[PDB]
Design a protein around this nucleic acid. Structure first.
Ligand SMILES: [Au+]
Ligand SMILES: [Au+]
Ligand SMILES: [Au+]
Lengths: 70, 120, 128, 63
DNA sequence: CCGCAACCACAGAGTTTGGAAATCTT
DNA sequence: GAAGATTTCCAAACTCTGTGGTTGCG
Protein backbone atom coordinates (compact mmCIF):
# COMPACT_ATOMS: atom_id res chain seq x y z
CA UNK A 1 0.00 0.00 0.00
CA UNK A 2 0.98 3.67 -0.47
CA UNK A 3 0.41 5.98 2.51
CA UNK A 4 1.02 9.61 3.55
CA UNK A 5 3.62 10.26 6.23
CA UNK A 6 1.33 12.96 7.61
CA UNK A 7 -1.71 10.77 8.11
CA UNK A 8 -2.70 9.64 11.59
CA UNK A 9 -2.74 5.86 11.37
CA UNK A 10 0.74 6.16 9.91
CA UNK A 11 1.97 8.00 12.95
CA UNK A 12 -0.01 5.89 15.39
CA UNK A 13 1.46 2.78 13.82
CA UNK A 14 4.91 4.24 13.27
CA UNK A 15 5.06 5.21 16.94
CA UNK A 16 3.73 2.00 18.46
CA UNK A 17 6.24 0.14 16.30
CA UNK A 18 9.04 2.28 17.66
CA UNK A 19 7.88 1.33 21.13
CA UNK A 20 7.91 -2.38 20.34
CA UNK A 21 11.40 -1.94 18.88
CA UNK A 22 12.56 -0.24 22.07
CA UNK A 23 11.26 -3.28 23.99
CA UNK A 24 12.61 -5.72 21.46
CA UNK A 25 16.17 -4.44 21.60
CA UNK A 26 16.00 -3.70 25.32
CA UNK A 27 15.22 -7.39 25.61
CA UNK A 28 18.00 -8.67 23.38
CA UNK A 29 20.39 -6.72 25.56
CA UNK A 30 19.48 -8.83 28.57
CA UNK A 31 19.85 -12.07 26.65
CA UNK A 32 23.43 -11.20 25.76
CA UNK A 33 24.00 -10.00 29.28
CA UNK A 34 22.73 -13.39 30.53
CA UNK A 35 24.63 -15.45 27.96
CA UNK A 36 27.86 -13.87 29.23
CA UNK A 37 26.93 -14.52 32.85
CA UNK A 38 26.14 -18.14 32.01
CA UNK A 39 29.66 -18.33 30.67
CA UNK A 40 31.07 -17.44 34.05
CA UNK A 41 28.51 -19.61 35.80
CA UNK A 42 29.45 -22.59 33.64
CA UNK A 43 33.21 -21.98 33.72
CA UNK A 44 32.87 -22.21 37.51
CA UNK A 45 30.72 -25.35 37.47
CA UNK A 46 33.24 -27.08 35.19
CA UNK A 47 36.24 -26.27 37.37
CA UNK A 48 34.19 -27.43 40.36
CA UNK A 49 33.40 -30.74 38.69
CA UNK A 50 36.95 -31.14 37.48
CA UNK A 51 38.02 -31.14 41.12
CA UNK A 52 35.13 -33.47 41.95
CA UNK A 53 36.17 -35.88 39.20
CA UNK A 54 39.88 -35.53 39.99
CA UNK A 55 39.17 -36.12 43.68
CA UNK A 56 36.59 -38.91 43.36
CA UNK A 57 39.13 -40.70 41.15
CA UNK A 58 42.09 -40.61 43.52
CA UNK A 59 39.72 -42.00 46.15
CA UNK A 60 38.60 -44.93 44.02
CA UNK A 61 42.19 -45.86 43.21
CA UNK A 62 43.56 -45.63 46.78
CA UNK A 63 40.45 -47.60 47.86
CA UNK A 64 41.11 -50.42 45.40
CA UNK A 65 44.72 -50.88 46.56
CA UNK A 66 43.73 -51.69 50.14
CA UNK A 67 41.32 -54.18 48.66
CA UNK A 68 43.84 -55.98 46.42
CA UNK A 69 46.95 -55.44 48.54
CA UNK A 70 45.50 -56.91 51.75
CA UNK B 1 9.84 -36.25 21.33
CA UNK B 2 7.50 -39.23 20.97
CA UNK B 3 8.27 -41.68 18.17
CA UNK B 4 5.97 -44.02 16.27
CA UNK B 5 6.07 -46.85 13.80
CA UNK B 6 6.30 -46.06 10.10
CA UNK B 7 4.92 -48.26 7.34
CA UNK B 8 8.51 -49.53 6.93
CA UNK B 9 9.71 -51.98 9.64
CA UNK B 10 13.13 -50.38 9.60
CA UNK B 11 12.19 -46.81 10.55
CA UNK B 12 10.49 -44.83 13.26
CA UNK B 13 9.63 -41.15 13.07
CA UNK B 14 8.16 -38.46 15.29
CA UNK B 15 4.42 -38.15 15.69
CA UNK B 16 3.01 -35.04 14.08
CA UNK B 17 0.05 -33.05 15.41
CA UNK B 18 -3.19 -34.39 14.08
CA UNK B 19 -3.95 -30.87 12.84
CA UNK B 20 -1.64 -27.92 12.06
CA UNK B 21 -1.49 -24.55 10.36
CA UNK B 22 0.11 -24.03 6.98
CA UNK B 23 3.62 -22.53 7.18
CA UNK B 24 3.48 -22.55 10.96
CA UNK B 25 6.57 -24.07 12.60
CA UNK B 26 5.90 -27.46 14.19
CA UNK B 27 5.40 -27.79 17.95
CA UNK B 28 8.33 -30.22 18.11
CA UNK B 29 11.22 -30.84 15.70
CA UNK B 30 10.50 -33.76 13.36
CA UNK B 31 12.84 -36.76 13.59
CA UNK B 32 13.31 -39.91 11.53
CA UNK B 33 14.91 -42.88 13.29
CA UNK B 34 16.77 -45.83 11.83
CA UNK B 35 16.83 -49.14 13.69
CA UNK B 36 19.00 -50.89 11.11
CA UNK B 37 22.31 -49.25 10.28
CA UNK B 38 22.63 -46.11 8.25
CA UNK B 39 25.99 -44.51 7.57
CA UNK B 40 25.99 -40.88 8.60
CA UNK B 41 25.64 -38.19 5.91
CA UNK B 42 22.84 -40.22 4.34
CA UNK B 43 20.19 -37.79 3.13
CA UNK B 44 16.53 -37.96 4.02
CA UNK B 45 13.62 -36.04 2.59
CA UNK B 46 9.94 -36.00 3.29
CA UNK B 47 7.12 -35.35 0.83
CA UNK B 48 3.41 -35.63 1.47
CA UNK B 49 0.54 -36.53 -0.81
CA UNK B 50 -3.22 -36.92 -0.88
CA UNK B 51 -6.05 -38.08 -3.09
CA UNK B 52 -6.96 -34.36 -3.15
CA UNK B 53 -3.41 -32.95 -3.06
CA UNK B 54 -0.66 -34.96 -4.67
CA UNK B 55 2.47 -33.08 -3.68
CA UNK B 56 2.34 -30.53 -0.91
CA UNK B 57 4.69 -27.57 -0.66
CA UNK B 58 7.15 -28.28 2.16
CA UNK B 59 9.83 -26.22 3.81
CA UNK B 60 13.16 -27.68 4.91
CA UNK B 61 12.16 -31.28 4.24
CA UNK B 62 15.73 -32.34 3.63
CA UNK B 63 17.85 -33.63 6.50
CA UNK B 64 21.03 -35.68 7.05
CA UNK B 65 21.06 -38.86 9.14
CA UNK B 66 23.50 -38.66 12.02
CA UNK B 67 23.93 -41.49 14.45
CA UNK B 68 20.85 -43.29 13.10
CA UNK B 69 18.55 -40.30 13.51
CA UNK B 70 17.16 -37.72 11.14
CA UNK B 71 16.62 -34.40 12.87
CA UNK B 72 14.73 -31.82 10.82
CA UNK B 73 15.34 -28.10 11.27
CA UNK B 74 11.86 -26.47 11.17
CA UNK B 75 9.99 -28.78 8.84
CA UNK B 76 7.05 -26.70 7.66
CA UNK B 77 4.05 -27.83 5.69
CA UNK B 78 2.63 -25.41 3.17
CA UNK B 79 0.01 -26.81 0.91
CA UNK B 80 -3.32 -27.59 2.67
CA UNK B 81 -4.40 -31.24 2.82
CA UNK B 82 -8.11 -30.87 2.25
CA UNK B 83 -10.96 -30.58 4.75
CA UNK B 84 -11.46 -33.63 6.95
CA UNK B 85 -8.52 -35.14 5.04
CA UNK B 86 -4.92 -35.73 6.13
CA UNK B 87 -1.63 -36.12 4.30
CA UNK B 88 0.45 -39.24 4.08
CA UNK B 89 4.08 -38.41 4.24
CA UNK B 90 6.86 -40.22 2.51
CA UNK B 91 10.13 -40.41 4.28
CA UNK B 92 12.82 -41.33 1.84
CA UNK B 93 16.20 -42.46 3.20
CA UNK B 94 18.78 -42.00 0.45
CA UNK B 95 21.00 -45.07 0.58
CA UNK B 96 21.94 -47.67 -2.04
CA UNK B 97 19.27 -48.41 -2.77
CA UNK B 98 16.82 -45.90 -1.35
CA UNK B 99 14.42 -47.07 1.33
CA UNK B 100 10.97 -45.62 1.70
CA UNK B 101 8.70 -45.28 4.69
CA UNK B 102 5.17 -44.02 4.36
CA UNK B 103 3.16 -42.75 7.31
CA UNK B 104 -0.50 -42.60 6.31
CA UNK B 105 -2.94 -40.03 7.64
CA UNK B 106 0.01 -38.34 9.35
CA UNK B 107 -1.03 -34.72 9.73
CA UNK B 108 -3.84 -32.40 8.60
CA UNK B 109 -2.83 -29.04 7.13
CA UNK B 110 -5.49 -26.33 7.05
CA UNK B 111 -4.99 -22.60 6.51
CA UNK B 112 -6.09 -21.76 10.06
CA UNK B 113 -4.68 -24.71 11.92
CA UNK B 114 -6.45 -25.55 15.23
CA UNK B 115 -8.53 -22.62 16.55
CA UNK B 116 -10.42 -22.05 19.77
CA UNK B 117 -14.15 -22.52 19.07
CA UNK B 118 -15.35 -19.26 17.53
CA UNK B 119 -17.40 -17.56 20.23
CA UNK B 120 -20.68 -16.65 18.52
CA UNK C 1 15.79 -54.99 9.11
CA UNK C 2 15.78 -53.63 5.59
CA UNK C 3 12.69 -55.77 4.98
CA UNK C 4 9.86 -57.68 6.66
CA UNK C 5 9.68 -61.45 7.00
CA UNK C 6 7.95 -61.99 3.63
CA UNK C 7 7.47 -59.37 0.94
CA UNK C 8 5.45 -61.63 -1.35
CA UNK C 9 2.24 -62.05 0.66
CA UNK C 10 2.26 -58.42 1.73
CA UNK C 11 2.81 -56.89 -1.71
CA UNK C 12 0.12 -59.13 -3.16
CA UNK C 13 -2.46 -58.72 -0.37
CA UNK C 14 -1.53 -55.32 1.10
CA UNK C 15 -4.10 -52.97 -0.43
CA UNK C 16 -1.64 -50.08 -0.61
CA UNK C 17 0.72 -52.12 -2.80
CA UNK C 18 -1.74 -53.92 -5.04
CA UNK C 19 -3.38 -50.59 -5.90
CA UNK C 20 0.08 -49.44 -7.05
CA UNK C 21 1.00 -52.79 -8.57
CA UNK C 22 -1.24 -51.89 -11.54
CA UNK C 23 -0.16 -48.92 -13.74
CA UNK C 24 -1.65 -45.56 -12.83
CA UNK C 25 -1.41 -41.87 -13.71
CA UNK C 26 1.79 -40.36 -12.33
CA UNK C 27 3.07 -36.79 -12.62
CA UNK C 28 6.44 -35.09 -12.11
CA UNK C 29 6.62 -33.06 -8.93
CA UNK C 30 9.73 -31.01 -9.49
CA UNK C 31 9.85 -27.23 -9.21
CA UNK C 32 6.36 -25.79 -9.76
CA UNK C 33 7.53 -22.20 -9.33
CA UNK C 34 8.83 -21.93 -12.88
CA UNK C 35 6.46 -22.06 -15.89
CA UNK C 36 6.18 -25.42 -17.66
CA UNK C 37 9.24 -24.57 -19.76
CA UNK C 38 11.96 -24.55 -17.08
CA UNK C 39 10.40 -27.66 -15.56
CA UNK C 40 10.81 -30.05 -18.48
CA UNK C 41 14.29 -28.58 -18.81
CA UNK C 42 14.84 -29.40 -15.15
CA UNK C 43 13.24 -32.86 -15.26
CA UNK C 44 15.13 -33.95 -18.36
CA UNK C 45 18.17 -32.27 -16.84
CA UNK C 46 17.58 -34.34 -13.70
CA UNK C 47 17.15 -37.44 -15.87
CA UNK C 48 20.75 -36.69 -16.77
CA UNK C 49 21.65 -37.13 -13.09
CA UNK C 50 19.42 -40.15 -12.63
CA UNK C 51 17.23 -38.32 -10.14
CA UNK C 52 13.52 -37.75 -10.54
CA UNK C 53 10.79 -36.90 -8.09
CA UNK C 54 7.35 -38.34 -8.85
CA UNK C 55 4.06 -39.28 -7.18
CA UNK C 56 0.98 -41.39 -7.98
CA UNK C 57 -1.65 -38.74 -8.65
CA UNK C 58 -4.31 -41.30 -7.78
CA UNK C 59 -3.43 -42.25 -4.21
CA UNK C 60 -1.27 -39.18 -3.71
CA UNK C 61 1.72 -41.26 -2.75
CA UNK C 62 4.91 -39.23 -3.28
CA UNK C 63 8.22 -40.87 -4.26
CA UNK C 64 11.80 -39.85 -5.00
CA UNK C 65 13.40 -42.07 -7.62
CA UNK C 66 17.07 -42.97 -8.04
CA UNK C 67 18.04 -44.86 -11.19
CA UNK C 68 21.32 -46.65 -10.32
CA UNK C 69 22.22 -49.47 -7.86
CA UNK C 70 13.70 -56.19 -14.55
CA UNK C 71 16.68 -53.80 -14.62
CA UNK C 72 17.74 -50.44 -13.13
CA UNK C 73 17.91 -48.30 -16.27
CA UNK C 74 16.47 -45.32 -18.17
CA UNK C 75 15.51 -45.49 -21.83
CA UNK C 76 15.32 -42.83 -24.49
CA UNK C 77 14.04 -43.57 -28.02
CA UNK C 78 11.87 -46.65 -27.30
CA UNK C 79 9.40 -43.88 -27.99
CA UNK C 80 11.14 -40.59 -28.83
CA UNK C 81 8.28 -38.47 -27.51
CA UNK C 82 8.70 -39.51 -23.87
CA UNK C 83 11.01 -41.31 -21.41
CA UNK C 84 11.06 -44.81 -19.94
CA UNK C 85 12.34 -45.28 -16.41
CA UNK C 86 13.07 -48.04 -13.92
CA UNK C 87 14.08 -47.38 -10.32
CA UNK C 88 15.18 -49.76 -7.54
CA UNK C 89 13.40 -49.29 -4.20
CA UNK C 90 12.46 -50.62 -0.75
CA UNK C 91 8.99 -49.23 -0.08
CA UNK C 92 8.18 -50.26 3.51
CA UNK C 93 10.67 -53.14 3.64
CA UNK C 94 9.67 -54.76 0.34
CA UNK C 95 12.46 -54.54 -2.22
CA UNK C 96 10.84 -53.29 -5.38
CA UNK C 97 11.59 -51.84 -8.80
CA UNK C 98 9.63 -48.81 -9.93
CA UNK C 99 8.88 -48.69 -13.63
CA UNK C 100 7.00 -46.19 -15.73
CA UNK C 101 7.16 -43.59 -18.48
CA UNK C 102 6.58 -39.84 -18.60
CA UNK C 103 5.81 -37.72 -21.64
CA UNK C 104 8.67 -35.22 -21.77
CA UNK C 105 6.18 -32.57 -22.88
CA UNK C 106 3.25 -33.38 -20.61
CA UNK C 107 5.47 -34.27 -17.66
CA UNK C 108 2.80 -36.90 -17.13
CA UNK C 109 3.01 -40.67 -17.36
CA UNK C 110 2.04 -43.97 -15.76
CA UNK C 111 4.10 -46.40 -13.75
CA UNK C 112 3.87 -49.56 -11.72
CA UNK C 113 5.43 -51.09 -8.68
CA UNK C 114 7.30 -54.18 -9.78
CA UNK C 115 8.35 -56.22 -6.79
CA UNK C 116 11.92 -57.24 -7.54
CA UNK C 117 12.07 -60.94 -6.67
CA UNK C 118 15.86 -61.29 -6.92
CA UNK C 119 16.40 -58.38 -4.57
CA UNK C 120 13.68 -59.61 -2.21
CA UNK C 121 15.28 -63.05 -1.98
CA UNK C 122 18.73 -61.49 -1.61
CA UNK C 123 17.69 -59.09 1.15
CA UNK C 124 15.81 -61.86 2.98
CA UNK C 125 18.95 -64.01 3.07
CA UNK C 126 21.38 -61.19 3.90
CA UNK C 127 18.97 -60.15 6.65
CA UNK C 128 18.85 -61.80 10.08
CA UNK D 1 21.10 19.27 4.91
CA UNK D 2 22.50 18.72 1.43
CA UNK D 3 25.90 20.29 1.95
CA UNK D 4 28.88 18.67 0.24
CA UNK D 5 30.16 17.84 3.72
CA UNK D 6 26.97 15.92 4.54
CA UNK D 7 27.16 13.69 1.47
CA UNK D 8 30.46 12.58 2.97
CA UNK D 9 30.41 13.18 6.73
CA UNK D 10 27.21 11.14 7.05
CA UNK D 11 28.08 8.19 4.81
CA UNK D 12 31.50 8.42 6.43
CA UNK D 13 30.08 7.58 9.86
CA UNK D 14 27.81 4.86 8.48
CA UNK D 15 30.95 2.97 7.44
CA UNK D 16 32.24 3.10 11.01
CA UNK D 17 28.89 2.00 12.38
CA UNK D 18 28.34 -0.93 10.03
CA UNK D 19 31.80 -2.08 11.08
CA UNK D 20 31.17 -1.53 14.78
CA UNK D 21 27.96 -3.54 14.57
CA UNK D 22 29.52 -6.31 12.52
CA UNK D 23 32.33 -6.51 15.09
CA UNK D 24 30.04 -6.65 18.11
CA UNK D 25 27.92 -9.21 16.26
CA UNK D 26 30.85 -11.64 15.93
CA UNK D 27 31.75 -11.07 19.56
CA UNK D 28 28.32 -12.38 20.56
CA UNK D 29 28.22 -15.40 18.26
CA UNK D 30 31.68 -16.36 19.53
CA UNK D 31 30.41 -16.01 23.09
CA UNK D 32 27.48 -18.27 22.23
CA UNK D 33 29.78 -20.95 20.82
CA UNK D 34 31.83 -20.57 24.01
CA UNK D 35 28.69 -21.42 25.96
CA UNK D 36 28.04 -24.45 23.80
CA UNK D 37 31.62 -25.62 24.37
CA UNK D 38 31.44 -25.19 28.16
CA UNK D 39 28.00 -26.78 28.10
CA UNK D 40 29.46 -29.81 26.35
CA UNK D 41 32.39 -30.07 28.75
CA UNK D 42 29.89 -29.66 31.56
CA UNK D 43 27.62 -32.43 30.31
CA UNK D 44 30.61 -34.74 29.96
CA UNK D 45 32.16 -34.11 33.38
CA UNK D 46 28.63 -34.42 34.72
CA UNK D 47 27.99 -37.85 33.26
CA UNK D 48 31.62 -38.67 34.10
CA UNK D 49 31.02 -37.98 37.80
CA UNK D 50 27.76 -39.99 37.95
CA UNK D 51 29.94 -42.75 36.46
CA UNK D 52 32.80 -42.70 38.95
CA UNK D 53 30.05 -42.57 41.56
CA UNK D 54 28.41 -45.87 40.69
CA UNK D 55 31.87 -47.21 39.83
CA UNK D 56 33.07 -46.43 43.35
CA UNK D 57 29.67 -47.25 44.82
CA UNK D 58 29.64 -50.77 43.43
CA UNK D 59 33.25 -50.92 44.69
CA UNK D 60 32.16 -49.90 48.17
CA UNK D 61 29.54 -52.67 48.14
CA UNK D 62 32.17 -55.30 47.25
CA UNK D 63 33.76 -54.35 50.58
C1' DC E 1 -31.17 -20.93 12.93
C1' DC E 2 -26.73 -22.73 15.03
C1' DG E 3 -22.06 -24.67 15.18
C1' DC E 4 -18.18 -27.02 12.54
C1' DA E 5 -14.31 -26.80 9.74
C1' DA E 6 -12.44 -24.30 5.82
C1' DC E 7 -10.96 -20.04 3.31
C1' DC E 8 -9.47 -15.18 3.22
C1' DA E 9 -8.13 -10.76 5.21
C1' DC E 10 -5.60 -8.50 8.12
C1' DA E 11 -4.85 -6.23 12.55
C1' DG E 12 -0.90 -5.76 15.64
C1' DA E 13 2.99 -7.20 18.42
C1' DG E 14 7.89 -8.89 17.46
C1' DT E 15 12.09 -9.07 14.69
C1' DT E 16 15.62 -7.64 11.56
C1' DT E 17 18.33 -4.57 8.98
C1' DG E 18 20.35 -0.24 8.32
C1' DG E 19 20.66 4.91 7.92
C1' DA E 20 20.26 8.93 11.35
C1' DA E 21 21.74 11.47 15.52
C1' DA E 22 23.75 11.84 19.90
C1' DT E 23 27.66 10.40 22.82
C1' DC E 24 32.04 8.38 24.14
C1' DT E 25 37.11 7.07 23.54
C1' DT E 26 41.40 7.56 22.50
C1' DG F 1 39.70 19.24 19.27
C1' DA F 2 37.91 15.75 16.80
C1' DA F 3 38.02 11.26 13.80
C1' DG F 4 36.52 6.87 14.56
C1' DA F 5 33.97 3.63 17.57
C1' DT F 6 29.92 2.89 20.49
C1' DT F 7 25.16 3.71 21.55
C1' DT F 8 20.55 5.45 20.91
C1' DC F 9 16.61 7.01 17.74
C1' DC F 10 13.86 5.80 13.93
C1' DA F 11 11.92 3.79 9.69
C1' DA F 12 10.42 0.10 6.71
C1' DA F 13 10.05 -4.61 5.45
C1' DC F 14 9.19 -9.12 7.16
C1' DT F 15 7.51 -12.92 10.11
C1' DC F 16 4.04 -14.81 13.78
C1' DT F 17 -0.39 -15.67 15.65
C1' DG F 18 -4.98 -14.45 16.74
C1' DT F 19 -9.71 -12.50 15.66
C1' DG F 20 -13.45 -11.73 12.34
C1' DG F 21 -16.21 -12.07 8.19
C1' DT F 22 -18.07 -15.76 5.25
C1' DT F 23 -19.45 -20.22 3.49
C1' DG F 24 -21.27 -25.06 2.25
C1' DC F 25 -22.87 -29.11 5.11
C1' DG F 26 -25.14 -31.34 8.70
AU1 LIG G 1 0.14 -21.25 4.32
AU1 LIG H 1 15.76 -36.95 -20.45
AU1 LIG I 1 4.65 -49.91 -16.60
Amino acid sequence: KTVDKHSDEYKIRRERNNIAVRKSRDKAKMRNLETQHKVLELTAENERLQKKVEQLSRELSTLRNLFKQL
Amino acid sequence: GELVRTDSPNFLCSVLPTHWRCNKTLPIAFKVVALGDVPDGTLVTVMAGNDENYSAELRNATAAMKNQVARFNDLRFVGRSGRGKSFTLTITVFTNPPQVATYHRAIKITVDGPREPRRH
Amino acid sequence: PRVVPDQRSKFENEEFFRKLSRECEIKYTGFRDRPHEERQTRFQNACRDGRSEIAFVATGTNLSLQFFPSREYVDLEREAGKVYLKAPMILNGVCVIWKGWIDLHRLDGMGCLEFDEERAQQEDALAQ
